[PDB]
Amino acid sequence: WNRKRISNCVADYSVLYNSASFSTFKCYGVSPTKLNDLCFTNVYADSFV
Amino acid sequence: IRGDEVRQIAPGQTGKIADYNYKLPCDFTGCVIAWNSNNLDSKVGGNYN
Numbered sequence: 764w765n766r767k768r769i770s771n772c773v774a775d776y777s778v779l780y781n782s783a784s785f786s787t788f789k790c791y792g793v794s795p796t797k798l799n800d801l802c803f804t805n806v807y808a809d810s811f812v
Numbered sequence: 813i814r815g816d817e818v819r820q821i822a823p824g825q826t827g828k829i830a831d832y833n834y835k836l837p838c839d840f841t842g843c844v845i846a847w848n849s850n851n852l853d854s855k856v857g858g859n860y861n
């Protein structure tokens with residue numbers, strides 16, 4: 764699985780509404796409604812199939 | 813809605829449907845029913861209603 768550091772961002776994620784539709788989106792430790800009201804420190808993306 | 817967004821019909825969710833179209837309150841008493849309707853609400857060429 765591929766790990767990718769993420770830094771110096773602004774987590775808009777409204778751009779994802781336009782095209783991509785996600786079957787599952789589960790967040791642990793954070794309620795998803797608050798994801799706009801926060802700043803994230805050590806962000807890694809672990810990608811695979 | 814589409815199938816992938818049925819998860820968004822729930823308290824405390826976010827996404828297209830849960831922010832721009834239909835929002836449920838946190839202190840929600842009641843319940844949600846959803847069923848696939850491909851043989852009714854989808855036609856060849858695609859319903860755009």
Ligand SMILES: CCCCC/C=C\C/C=C/CCCCCCCC(=O)O
Nearest residue numbers: 769774776779788798806826827828
């Ligand atoms: C560059 C990758 C992301 C870096 C930021 C990481 C985490 C914070 C942003 C979190 C939101 C993840 C996308 C959720 C999209 C809405 C899904 C939906 O409601 O249908």
